[PDB]
Amino acid sequence: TTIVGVKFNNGVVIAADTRSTQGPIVADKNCAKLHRISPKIWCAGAGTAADTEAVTQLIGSNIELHSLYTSREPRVVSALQMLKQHLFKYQGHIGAYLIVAGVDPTGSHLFSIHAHGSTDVGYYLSLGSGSLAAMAVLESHWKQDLTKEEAIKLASDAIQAGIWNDLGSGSNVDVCVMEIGKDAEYLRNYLTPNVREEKQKSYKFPRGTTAVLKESIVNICDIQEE
Amino acid sequence: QFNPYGDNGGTILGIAGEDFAVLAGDTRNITDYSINSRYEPKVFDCGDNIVMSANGFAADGDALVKRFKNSVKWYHFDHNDKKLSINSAARNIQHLLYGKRFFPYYVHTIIAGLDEDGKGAVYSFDPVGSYEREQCRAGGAAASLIMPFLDNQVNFKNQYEPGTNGKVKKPLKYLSVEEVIKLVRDSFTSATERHIQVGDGLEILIVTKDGVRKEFYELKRD
Amino acid sequence: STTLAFRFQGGIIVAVDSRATAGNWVASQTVKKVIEINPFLLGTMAGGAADCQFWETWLGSQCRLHELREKERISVAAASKILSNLVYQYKGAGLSMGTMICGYTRKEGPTIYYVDSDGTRLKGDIFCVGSGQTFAYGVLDSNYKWDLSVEDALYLGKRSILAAAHRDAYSGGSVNLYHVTEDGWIYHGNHDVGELFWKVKEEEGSFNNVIG
Amino acid sequence: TQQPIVTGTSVISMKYDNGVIIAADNLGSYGSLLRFNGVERLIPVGDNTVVGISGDISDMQHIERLLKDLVTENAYDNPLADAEEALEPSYIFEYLATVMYQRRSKMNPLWNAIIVAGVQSNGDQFLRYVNLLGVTYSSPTLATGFGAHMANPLLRKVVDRESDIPKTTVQVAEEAIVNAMRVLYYRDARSSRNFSLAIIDKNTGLTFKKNLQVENMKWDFAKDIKGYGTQKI
Amino acid sequence: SDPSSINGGIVVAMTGKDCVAIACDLRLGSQSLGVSNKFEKIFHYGHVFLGITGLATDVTTLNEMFRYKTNLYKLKEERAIEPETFTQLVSSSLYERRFGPYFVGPVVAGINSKSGKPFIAGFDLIGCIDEAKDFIVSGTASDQLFGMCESLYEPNLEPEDLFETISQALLNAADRDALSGWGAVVYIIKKDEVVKRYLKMRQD
Amino acid sequence: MDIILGIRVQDSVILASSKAVTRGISVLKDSDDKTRQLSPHTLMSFAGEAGDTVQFAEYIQANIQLYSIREDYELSPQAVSSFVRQELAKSIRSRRPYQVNVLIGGYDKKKNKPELYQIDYLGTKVELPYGAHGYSGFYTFSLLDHHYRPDMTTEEGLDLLKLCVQELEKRMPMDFKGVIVKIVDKDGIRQVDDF
Amino acid sequence: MDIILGIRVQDSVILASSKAVTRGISVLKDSDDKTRQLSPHTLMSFAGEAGDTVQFAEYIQANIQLYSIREDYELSPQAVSSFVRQELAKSIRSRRPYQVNVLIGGYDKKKNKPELYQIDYLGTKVELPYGAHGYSGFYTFSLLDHHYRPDMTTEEGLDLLKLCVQELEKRMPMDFKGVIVKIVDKDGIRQVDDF
Amino acid sequence: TSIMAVTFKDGVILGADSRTTTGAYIANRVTDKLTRVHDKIWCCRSGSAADTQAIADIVQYHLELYTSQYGTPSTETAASVFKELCYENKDNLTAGIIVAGYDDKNKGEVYTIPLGGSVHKLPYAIAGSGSTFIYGYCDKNFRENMSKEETVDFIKHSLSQAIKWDGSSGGVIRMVVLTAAGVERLIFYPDEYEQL
Amino acid sequence: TSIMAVTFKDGVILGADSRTTTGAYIANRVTDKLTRVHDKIWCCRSGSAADTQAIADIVQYHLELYTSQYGTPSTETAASVFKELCYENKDNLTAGIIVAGYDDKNKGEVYTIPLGGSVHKLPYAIAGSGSTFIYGYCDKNFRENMSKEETVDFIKHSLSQAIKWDGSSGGVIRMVVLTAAGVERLIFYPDEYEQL
Ligand SMILES: *[B]([O])([O])[C]([C][C]([C])[C])[N]C(=O)[C]([C]C1=[C][C]=[C][C]=[C]1)[N]C(=O)C1=[C]N=[C][C]=N1
Ligand SMILES: *[B]([O])([O])[C]([C][C]([C])[C])[N]C(=O)[C]([C]C1=[C][C]=[C][C]=[C]1)[N]C(=O)C1=[C]N=[C][C]=N1
Ligand SMILES: *[B]([O])([O])[C]([C][C]([C])[C])[N]C(=O)[C]([C]C1=[C][C]=[C][C]=[C]1)[N]C(=O)C1=[C]N=[C][C]=N1
Ligand SMILES: *[B]([O])([O])[C]([C][C]([C])[C])[N]C(=O)[C]([C]C1=[C][C]=[C][C]=[C]1)[N]C(=O)C1=[C]N=[C][C]=N1
Ligand SMILES: [Cl-]
Ligand SMILES: [Cl-]
Ligand SMILES: [Mg+2]
Ligand SMILES: [Mg+2]
Ligand SMILES: [Mg+2]
Ligand SMILES: [Mg+2]
């Protein structure tokens, strides 16, 4: 997994590759690693996939109830605090490594979270097996006062570095832009630089090629009238 | 503690035709989650119209190929420039592998060429030297992805003729070199999609009575 | 692996399966688990593929040297003991072999020796070796007689491997039959289990548990 | 079987249109202790080859002595020692690769990762890797240790395949190498600011640069970072 | 020892033009010993189909659990559960056993009754959802199934063509696995008719 | 304990179970009945770890007998087998699991059909024409695969069972001291006193 | 292998040895003769690890036969037993020791006395009126302690041996498939074909 | 990690490097290890980042609740709350914390809490993996009642050496000054402190 | 153990503590760790007492035999002989040795040989368990071309701190001065160096 977060002039952008793997096998080629905690708070997850999903849903659910209770839009620090205290309690066993970003009435924010519950602040961050390839790009091209267009470019380039150089990462680039005073735009499959070429042959079989023993209609309908 | 073995990934494929044989292999070389090289040749022309590849731990793979190439050289010296037949090469490789039975070459070896009747031949080895002539064999990381496809599309397994419903099998008609290369390319394209250690490039060596020809094709680099 | 061999009126029947596995992965369905040592000697292969292949083709070289030196066919006893003495030298090193050495000479008649990588060497009338040996034993022991016809003996061997091919997960592929007589062995074909199972089920009335 | 004691970190390298570049820092670490600050890990062989070595320093010094001895031995009864029968990069590499694989096979390895950079007689660029296991491979860019994870991605953006080599100049290539060394200093906990760089060109020969430093570093943004989440002061 | 490969077995699912297909083998074993050749691994709750591979006791337990839950769902909601909703229910139910999980590899298949859209999904033993457009694989011969599906599959196959593709994917994958086979079943699923076909295969 | 076998024929279910009980070095008993009657038309044989086997069987027996009294009705073999499976499936994730494998042979009086269920200690249930636990199946399934029919009589079932026991007595290393055979049919449960 | 017994009576030595050979799961053979004739009036039975047993016995056999030819003379049982003990005492400190236990039954033609020696794989020798290796002695020594006399006939020795084998067949878990019995006396070695 | 706290005439100064490592990878090169548990009570963190954050967050909560009831807490009180958490949970924690604070009555105070959970009141304290390399230097160069400028130089020179020799330490040198005047943050970059 | 060797204007000086420990028991409080392999080539020993004695004895033999054939050996040559023994027997040895010597041509030279068996020529070297605590101090206070009196003070102050913090170091501070003038032994007792 390669996930990144990049701060810019009037907000923050996060990005991620779309490969999931069980050992050396690719389980899903177009996996969605950008999760929505609230409308303008999104986070990217690396590590154990069920855990990043579950911990995001739980905190996102409680954040929604909190937002309704307080009559206020949710804050990134609240999501951060609730995530870290949950993860700390489970002593690293919940394998969720998160980059949490968002905009709220306080401003724009960017944090990282690790499985044992430690948090970090930064202008640019990267997590996952391809974080070293991504951080190399970020350390080479990042500057202060980036524009929106520059930050998207930098973020996607950092993911590409992971896609091409890290075997744990691949396929497509997902992006989510969170600008102050605007709706967050979720750009699913922002880049698609890994379409499979046409196959040499069609493997459509002639009908009747497989040997059958029995046929029967399956009753999916309910018990009928009359 | 020191571990003398490693895993360099990769995948290889040998298919025997009626008067030809192909030995294919991807050009990617890896350790853990890193790429060492996008183009590191893995299939080699060993002389006497024999092609070879030893997939797995690359250090052992290179050592074995090097020692077999050497064996071909000394076979010419010792036996009046006689051509080493594919069956004789196979038996020789068994002894090279079994010689290190208690500290094995950690590789899956495949050789390809023509037998003494001019027909296509592929031989397959395990790490400690057991071998067998085959019509079809994939080796290495994505072998488990490729072999079933070749059982189906080369040997027409589980395929029958329409109208008869399981009574009459699909006849085992011979495949041309153009037809085999299509199946090789699709095998590696599919393996690249679902196996992280497979990609970058595909190099195919084709063996006929005329000699050894090479073909290269791009594979996905992610 | 399921391999068997048994003595009877018409000599020896040898029958083996064809499967080779690495864990749960089926590595090959076309393995030759019978070795043609000479026109009178056969060896079966179970355990490590390489160990068996290597040392049994080696055995054939030692047998050829014996009859070059002694101007006489090697006995089954002597041939089996060359292999057992060899593997005994390697005892502890981790060789993995279960083999039957089968042959027919004038002085001995039809003879079978079970040879083992632990050094065990046993003469006997019936042997089954491999992961599916217990399944083959069931069919053999209930149907075996000394007075079997070459045709009926061949079928019993074929059927016993089929029984093990069905139940044992690490056995299958196809059945190779050999028949060893006073005038040498005779190959009796490769029999695909995928076609043999349905054929036997229909004709014999067996496997009523399975649906066809 | 042993364990490495005094160690050297990344060696990085790449091909360009007329030759090859290789670099490595001058640190000898003793675990987490940054013990020795003046260790040269690029060792030239003749005027056409540079061997870069990472890993155990005692084994590096042994290899250094083997190469020194190799030059001496090649000169023996060799009137063309400084001409047609001089040591090639390919000869030096194959020798090391032989030794590395032999030593791993005796279960007593030289605990190193080695990159042999050079230019052949016919002007062809030579760049190949070998390590404690005897594993070998070649690529337009090569790097050891942390370099493999951080340098290669950056260097591969310049030369992504073989056809990009003629299009890459020595100025562009050196720039990429120097930037990669900076990135490694930011991110490798066992690296130093001081490093050595070597260029082997088919026209201008061997240029060996010592006492280089990582410069143009970005740290100013650190002042704005406060706490680990909620803290404002 | 490894719970996910004591009993053995496989499940595969595929989408086609206005249809879906889900298939499984019939083997249940105790490691090397084959025990049963009638152990079906595909179940259905209304029009939603669920395949489950892995430890057989958990396969049975989860079927009974999801029958329980979908029956209560239907009584309260006054409608059959849909594939998208059932997928979330499987995920929730597996994750609640995070640190004492069911050793299974579930696969959901079906057509949404309102939109008519074909749907398939897969899971790991603890709840992660893999929602693929093309195909899902599970079991001891998953590597083999991935290879077959990735080469044989093409989009927008007609029901009777899709049957041939999925059947050949299962059969040839099973034949390269020691712990799979001993028969096979294929479900072809359309918006308001479902055909079930038992396949003839080698019994070793 | 060691060997337990089961076979379902036309009109009955036959269970065979070894008589030996071995405390490591010695055979303490050669007449042990490894079975419990759960209901008039349902019999359960068992084998596993010492103590757990009897404790589990008698616990199941008590529960089914309780059900029978409460409802004045006999549960179907299918229903009893499902209850037993759930108890074992519950048990496998307990502090100390029941290490017990069972066969359940019953005659369903409603459907007029014999039924044989094989359940292991994990809670793995399968309905079968013939079954076994432990190393018994390794020898006996090949014979049953060859000779078995769905339309066999009880006498033919006993003959096929004798062939299984003879094979076991020939090829198994352990002396299991013969078997106690019991038949389950429409008239209930009875023991074959000469086998 | 498993059970080997020995008993020295008035005028002979009787050795009994099991017939079974078991490769883990299956009984591969039920007619195995676990003994070798070392000389016309000396017999050695053996039991231990597979391969090692036969390899050791045949090695000892070859050595004693070599001695017999060289000197045209038969070694006394005491002398043969000492030679065997030394080989095992040498073996126990080798790279890979012989894992073999033996009984040596012989008739000394000089002293006109039967002699029974028990030697284990360590090279531990004892002369005894009756002996056993493995778990056999645990069952049989109590019977022999009660019934044995130095003045018993060969027929009485065989009856006392039958009582030992019957006890073993009752209380031992493993089916050892009966025993081959051999008698060693002044006339040499012979096998009791019905036991 | 290289951290230290030093009392001086006008109060106390905390100092720290900015490196966080996962093995040999620098996971964060601009970390802030000087953390605030009260207006003029701060701490230096070493050991597990998760543990020391969790502890500091709990302490900040306790002192915020203390303040609401009993007014401003002493530095000794803050150290005691750290100790209670570190001692009672010693089996499950890896935390080496230096507590430093400024009262008007007690002036500058420094308390160090090593792994065991013991408390030690000292004129100055050093901790973290990099502290080992500067015990000699700090003992020889420390004086009581130094000036602000002298104390800044003492910390700057000390941590410079700790960074130089310890691989786990690096980046910028952060400092926090605690006096009657208020709270001042200082930062010193590599180009400055490496040439010392 | 705290050992060091320092080159200066007139030559080189070796320094060492005198403590030998079996766990926490001081088996010898007056040990001599400064040992002679040639007239003006000495070494400092750290690690196993047996290993470093065995090595030093072998080296003294090699240099005595060298001298009889080829005349006085260089310090570099002596270091190479130490290295050969330490490198080739790395699996079985625990020896950290500093070699120091005075030539007239090369003047004062110092070579350090850590555990691996690598060689490092340096202006000065420090080693032993106690050296960790004085890396900071020694780096800040070392100058090239010091006087004899300055170098003695540098070593005395450095080892004083190493002794103060390291439990494995203690006793007296032994020193050996190597110059053109000859070989001088110095000793400094606790009452002297503790008050520094
Ligand atoms: B990434 O590489 O970190 C990636 C991101 C994930 C959140 C979508 N992780 C995975 O792909 C993990 C790898 C992994 C394997 C085994 C244990 C822990 C982590 N994969 C999965 O979580 C996974 C594997 N198989 C099916 C579903 N999910
Ligand atoms: B048989 O099962 O013993 C079989 C016969 C062998 C001679 C070809 N052996 C194997 O298949 C073994 C695995 C094995 C399975 C069951 C019991 C013991 C061993 N396989 C191999 O040795 C082997 C060799 N090369 C590749 C894959 N597998
Ligand atoms: B320092 O090195 O002690 C530092 C202080 C921490 C409060 C930021 N700790 C770390 O960097 C630790 C590892 C460690 C290194 C050396 C000694 C003790 C601990 N790192 C982490 O805790 C860490 C690493 N990666 C992610 C999250 N946390
Ligand atoms: B010094 O502490 O390293 C010292 C130097 C030795 C040459 C006199 N070493 C020892 O005292 C060693 C133990 C040790 C301590 C610290 C680091 C490494 C080793 N002691 C012994 O070798 C010893 C102790 N008692 C008797 C004999 N030898
Ligand atoms: Cl932190
Ligand atoms: Cl000493
Ligand atoms: Mg790939
Ligand atoms: Mg099978
Ligand atoms: Mg079961
Ligand atoms: Mg540092």
Domain boundaries, chain E: 1-204
C-alpha closest to that of H165 among H125, H124, H141, H194 = H194
Residue of chain E with shortest Cα separation from C197: E203
Element holding H109 (H helix, E strand)? strand H108-113
Angstrom CA distances, I93 to B41, C8, E58, stand at 43, 69, 56
- Residue A117 touches chain H, beta carbons under 8 Å: yes
Ligand 2 site residues (CB inside 6 A) read B 126, 130; C 1, 20-22, 27, 31, 33, 45-49, 52, 130-131, 170
The pair phi, psi for residue H63, each rounded to 5°, is -75, -30
The pair phi, psi for residue G22, each rounded to 5°, is -120, 115
Angstrom CA distances, D89 to D44, D117, D169, G180, stand at 10, 7, 22, 76
CA-angle at I81, arms to I133 and I75, nearest 5°:
70
Which residue among F130, F140, F149 sits closest to C138, beta carbon to beta carbon?
F140
d(CA G105, CA E82): 83
Domain at C1-212, CATH homologous superfamily: Aminohydrolase, N-terminal nucleophile (Ntn) domain (3.60.20.10)
Domain boundaries, chain H: 1-196
Adjacency order of strands within the sheet including F130-133? F130-133, F4-8, F12-18, F179-185, F188-192
Q: DSSP labels for E49-101? A: EEEEEE-HHHHHHHHHHHHHHHHHHHHHHSSPPPHHHHHHHHHHHHHTTTTS-
Instruction: Tell me whether strands F21-23 and F12-18 are parallel, antiparallel or unpaired.
Output: unpaired
C-alpha closest to that of C127 among C140, C143, C142, C117 = C140
C-alpha closest to that of H131 among H158, H167, H95 = H158
Question: Which residues on F lie below 8 Å from C141 (Cβ)?
Answer: 167, 170-171
Burial (CB < 10 A; 0-12, 13-18, 19+), residue E25, is buried
Q: For residue H92, how many other CB atoms are within 10 A of its CB?
A: 8
Position C199, amino acid: K
d(CA B103, CA B124): 20
d(CA F184, CA F157): 12
Helices C76-89 + C49-70 axis angle, to 10: 130
Burial (CB < 10 A; 0-12, 13-18, 19+), residue H123, is middle
Domain boundaries, chain C: 1-212
Residue pair G2/G176 in contact by the 8 Å Cβ criterion? yes
Q: What is the experimental resolution, given in Å to one decimal place?
A: 2.6
User: Is there a contact between A220 and E146 if contact means CB atoms under 8 Å apart?
Assistant: no
Residue pair C46/C55 in contact by the 8 Å Cβ criterion? no
d(CA A104, CA E16): 44
d(CA H161, CA H133): 7
**Structural domains in chain A, sorted by start:** 1-226 (3.60.20.10)
Name the residue of I30, I48, I115 to mutate for ligand 4: max ligand atoms within 8 A of Cβ. Answer: I48
Report the CATH fold assignment for E1-204. Answer: Glutamine Phosphoribosylpyrophosphate, subunit 1, domain 1 (3.60.20)
Residue labelled with tokens 């009294």: F69
d(CA C23, CA E177): 9
User: Is there a contact between D62 and I90 if contact means CB atoms under 8 Å apart?
Assistant: no
User: Structure tokens of H94?
Assistant: 């890896």
User: Is there a contact between B142 and E147 if contact means CB atoms under 8 Å apart?
Assistant: yes
Instruction: Tell me whether strands A25-28 and A34-38 are parallel, antiparallel or unpaired.
Output: unpaired
User: Structure tokens of E67?
Assistant: 């029958």
| Residue H166 DSSP one-character state | B
User: Structure tokens of A221?
Assistant: 């309908």
Position D85, amino acid: E
d(CA E103, CA I177): 74
SS3 E154: coil
Residue pair B126/B108 in contact by the 8 Å Cβ criterion? yes
SS3 B124: strand
Give the total residue count for chain F. Answer: 195
SS3 E108: strand
- Residue E18 touches chain B, beta carbons under 8 Å: no
d(CA F99, CA D150): 54
User: Structure tokens of A226?
Assistant: 């009359």
Element holding H25 (H helix, E strand)? strand H25-28
Chain H: closest CA distance from residue I119 (Å): 20
Residue pair I133/D33 in contact by the 8 Å Cβ criterion? no
Chain C: closest CA distance from residue E36 (Å): 9
User: Structure tokens of D205?
Assistant: 């020969």
User: Structure tokens of B21?
Assistant: 């044989």
Residue of C142, C159, C200 best to disrupt the F interface, most CBs of F under 10 A: C142
User: Structure tokens of I171?
Assistant: 């006793």
Domain at I1-196, CATH homologous superfamily: Aminohydrolase, N-terminal nucleophile (Ntn) domain (3.60.20.10)
SS3 B83: coil
The pair phi, psi for residue D136, each rounded to 5°, is -130, 145
User: Is there a contact between D6 and I87 if contact means CB atoms under 8 Å apart?
Assistant: no
User: Is there a contact between C136 and F145 if contact means CB atoms under 8 Å apart?
Assistant: no
Report the CATH number that the domain containing residue F191 is assigned in CATH: 3.60.20.10
Residue labelled with tokens 């890193």: B34
Which residue among C163, C166, C209 sits closest to F148, beta carbon to beta carbon?
C209
Residue pair E61/F89 in contact by the 8 Å Cβ criterion? yes
Q: For residue I188, how many other CB atoms are within 10 A of its CB?
A: 18
How many Cα atoms within 13 Å fall on the side-chain side of residue F170? Answer: 17
Residue D32 CA, closest ligand 3 atom number: 16
C-alpha closest to that of H166 among D189, I96, I4, D183 = D189
User: Which residue's CA is the nearest one to ligand 3's atom 16?
Assistant: H168
Which residue among D1, D2, D6 sits closest to I118, beta carbon to beta carbon?
D6
d(CA F126, CA F118): 5
Angstrom CA distances, A78 to A81, A82, E126, G116, stand at 5, 6, 27, 89
User: Structure tokens of F146?
Assistant: 């060859």
Residue labelled with tokens 């067996």: C206
Burial (CB < 10 A; 0-12, 13-18, 19+), residue A132, is buried
Helices (H), chain G: 52-71, 77-91, 136-147, 154-171
Residue pair H98/H14 in contact by the 8 Å Cβ criterion? yes
C-alpha closest to that of A190 among A16, A74, A73 = A16
User: Structure tokens of F40?
Assistant: 């008039």
Domain of residue D9 covers: 1-233
Q: For residue D7, how many other CB atoms are within 10 A of its CB?
A: 23
User: Which residue's CA is the nearest one to ligand 1's atom 16?
Assistant: A22
Residues in CB range of H10: below 8 A, 6 or more apart: H108, H147, H148, H179, H180, H181
Ligand positioned closest to the Cα atom of H160? 10
d(CA E8, CA G170): 41
Domain of residue F186 covers: 1-195
Q: Count structural domains, chain D.
A: 1
Residues in CB range of B192: below 8 A, 6 or more apart: B26, B198, B199, B219, B220
Instruction: Tell me whether strands C109-116 and H25-28 are parallel, antiparallel or unpaired.
Output: unpaired
d(CA G113, CA G12): 8
C-alpha closest to that of H25 among A166, D191, A169, A162 = D191
Q: For residue H90, how many other CB atoms are within 10 A of its CB?
A: 14
Confirm whether I75 is a catalytic residue: no
SS3 B210: coil
Q: For residue A188, how many other CB atoms are within 10 A of its CB?
A: 13
CA-angle at E196, arms to E194 and E202, nearest 5°:
155
